[PDB]
């Protein structure tokens, strides 16, 4: 049959649940040139993003979301069946998914009790690893990785593996970005997106920030015209000075609402513990989380269960929405 | 250094030149929901395309162009370093590019003198091949593959490999589509696009038509949200009844202009031979093609050199544009 021909690995492969900005920001097309193929790397988007991130244009690569960026790094550096990828659970699921789909080995070193890196465990499992992913701030936990530890991770992998900092939520704590470290570390790569703070998840637009040599290797493995013209168009508009300003206003409004939500949740009986976050979502441990999860779910309040993630039993991840959405969750709880 | 960490294979990896519709067809967004992630396979687009192609909705897969479709088939069926892909030159370059990028072997059996398939050579090289690509009408030659030979190819691979018919130009000769053969062949897959006749190359929207079992395996290897909301939006509009009608009008206008261009070129001294085409481009052999190519190029008339393709020495591929664009080429020649 048909499935027997498939690769073995392939044969076995209120909305507050996806970390999206709660409100739609309107945009309209300005470039009616849809009959022609777009440029491989839209100049307007790349230059606007480089100014925003404070890096050189030659250190930026635009792709179909940060998700494509994760895949590209594996495609360029890992030899299937020979090389490995390393990540530290509980974290973003796409790292393992892309590697498993591609047929590359996954090495996992779970983080310590406070979600920080187990530097000793990592140094013991580096042999044969080509790419290390580290999400900071981490999804779903919400916290930043100590920069001192990132320095250690960078020293450990110097000339052995590429270290990828997933900064999908860096807009909520801009001061913590490692974008300024590129000059010191040739093997450091950073993933950025327009899907979260930028309120543009529907666009599927992301970026990889790395030194020119890395960017050039990634250009060799990326699809010929990765971005559509309508996406490049809207993206350049959102990356304009006025757009960066409107973005910052969105972040500020989300942080204020996040602080209200944390304060209120800490007063609710069933809520055992609320963890600090530097993002647009809150991880909280509940007494009988599955019961509470199904209850809200039936009420039409959709969260994200994390009960099955390593060390997250009892936890649910709540995305920060509007004041009215927060009130619905509080009242419901 | 950084490159030493890259995979070996990766380390070594008037506009009438890209087969685009000459005129821009205008479209505007109707869905302002950009803050939320899009559905994995937009229902409107898939149902509209299924009605258009006359297939079941469960036999359609939408991707970032037919180019992504080519990649998906290799990712689902070919084991890197073990399985092979087979194509017949001179043809579309992306087949080999995707395989080489992924690390899968390429087996080539050039076509016969009339560009038809060498069935005996193919049957001799099938061992270890999982996917066979066949472009019909062929790019850059312009002709259709004899359906009798496709039947033979389908029998040869029955239960051994997937046969992919690249129908990127099928809108110019709708009667020749193999979309109706799906019921008889479980291993047949078809690639379609909105980049050529549909005048929407800037959208990066393509489709794969195959039996449900194949489609399901491809769903397992495709990126989670392959299509952006603005693309899904415009694509559903272009696939509406009125849009299919406007599309057909475009095809008719292109075919009439193509016939004029062929007639006129056959009268030009430097033009040694003009080959018949069932598409929106014309392959022609010239006396001193490089000299003619550079000359037009300096004049601002951009064609596509094919001089280096197997059996195409002296040939240039001319995309059919507007009446004024055809006149510029004729006069220039
Ligand atoms: C949302 C997210 C991404 C990917 O974003 P896209 O640009 O939508 O692909 C990557 N990493 C983390 C941790 C995320 O939460
Ligand atoms: C244009 C073309 C494609 C790909 O089209 P997209 O939808 O733009 O990726 C595939 N095959 C052939 C032969 C083509 O000419």
Swiss-Prot record, chains A, B:
Protein name (record): Histidinol-phosphate aminotransferase
One GO CC annotation: cytosol
Protein's UniProt keywords contain Protein biosynthesis: no
Family: Belongs to the class-II pyridoxal-phosphate-dependent aminotransferase family. Histidinol-phosphate aminotransferase subfamily.
Listed Pfam families: Aminotran_1_2
GO molecular function, one term: identical protein binding
Protein origin, superkingdom: Bacteria
Gene transcribed to yield this protein: hisC
Transcription found in the keyword field: no
NCBIfam families: hisC (TIGR01141)
Catalytic activity: L-histidinol phosphate + 2-oxoglutarate = 3-(imidazol-4-yl)-2-oxopropyl phosphate + L-glutamate
Top-level EC class as recorded in UniProt: transferase
GO biological process, one term: L-histidine biosynthetic process
EC number(s) on file: 2.6.1.9
